[PDB]
């Protein structure tokens, strides 16, 4: 979040790796900007 606009950048892998976060290089492309204007101090995940 910056000057009232929230932002999301995202990507996914082609790999089927063994167990832990790999040291390869692949940079995240921008997905969406959102004009939400809210003060955020904390966040939570939603699982199934």
């Amino acid at each position: 979040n910056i000057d009232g606009y929230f932002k999301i950048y995202s990507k996914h892998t082609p790999i089927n790796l063994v167990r832990d976060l790999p040291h390869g290089f692949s940079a995240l492309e921008p997905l969406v900007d959102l004009p939400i204007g809210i003060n955020i101090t904390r966040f939570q995940t939603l699982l199934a």
């Binding site: 929230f6 959102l34 809210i38 101090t41 904390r42 966040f43 995940t45 939603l46 699982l47 199934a48």
Partner: protein, 48 residues
């Protein structure tokens, strides 16, 4: 597909606004409201 989205905010109880990000079996829904969020938000699926 267990990660479904996120809550972002500060009070998380409709004292002030907060952002809901969710994916369900139809679409990604994005929403800002005076949300009285659950003390443990989730999605649940009856698998098979």
């Amino acid at each position: 597909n267990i990660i479904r989205g996120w809550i972002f905010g500060t009070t998380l109880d409709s004292k002030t606004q907060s952002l809901l990000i969710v994916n369900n079996a139809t679409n990604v829904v994005i929403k800002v409201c005076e949300f009285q969020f659950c003390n443990d938000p989730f999605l649940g699926v009856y698998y098979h």
